[PDB]
Amino acid sequence: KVFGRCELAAAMKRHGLDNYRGYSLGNWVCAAKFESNFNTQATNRNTDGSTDYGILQINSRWWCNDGRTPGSRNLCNIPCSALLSSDITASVNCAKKIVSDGNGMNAWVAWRNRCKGTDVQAWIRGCRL
Ligand SMILES: [Cl-]
Ligand SMILES: [Cl-]
Ligand SMILES: [Cl-]
Ligand SMILES: [Cl-]
Ligand SMILES: [Cl-]
Ligand SMILES: [Cl-]
Ligand code: NA
């Protein structure tokens, strides 16, 4: 599913991501834009042989099981395919665990390089939230 910007903002807000660990909704929308272009089906292979899955590009090295990332963990206790669903519940639940890990949203490289310290409020402009 390719979400619209405000559709995704509303879904993230409903599932409790707005101000989760102190990160306003625009941070999460910005991260999704640059990680996945709002496409739940996005997958990208990493150099180390892990893969990133879904709207927030969650890595099989630590967070989900894809059966092909040797020596990896499954800390969200989910198949990585669950992170590709049209329903973002699994991705949001796992992202809450990731952002609680101690480095906040720096876990998302595209957030750190493209969203951090920018006007992230712009990402929820016009949305009826
Ligand atoms: Cl914001
Ligand atoms: Cl497996
Ligand atoms: Cl594996
Ligand atoms: Cl959803
Ligand atoms: Cl933080
Ligand atoms: Cl500034
Ligand atoms: Na894994």
CATH number for position 32: 1.10.530.10
Q: Which residues pair with 2 in a beta bridge?
A: 39
Alpha carbon distance 110, 97 (integer Å): 18
Breaks (C-N over 2.5 A) in the chain follow: none
Name, in order, each residue with C-beta under 8 angstroms of 15's C-beta and a sequence gap of 6 or more.
Answer: 88, 89, 92, 93
The active-site residue out of 7, 35, 48, 66 is 35
- Outline where 37-120 has alpha helix (H): 89-99, 109-114
Ligand index nearest the alpha carbon of residue 120 = 1
Q: How many CB atoms lie within 10 A of CB 3?
A: 22
Q: What is the DSSP string of 96-121?
A: HHHHTSSSGGGGSHHHHHHTTTS-GG
Residue 35 is among the residues annotated as catalytic for this protein: yes
- The domain tally of the chain equals 1
Q: Which domain holds residue 82?
A: 1-129
Residue 66 is among the residues annotated as catalytic for this protein: no
Using what technique was this structure determined? X-ray
Resolution (A): 1.2
Alpha carbon distance 60, 72 (integer Å): 7
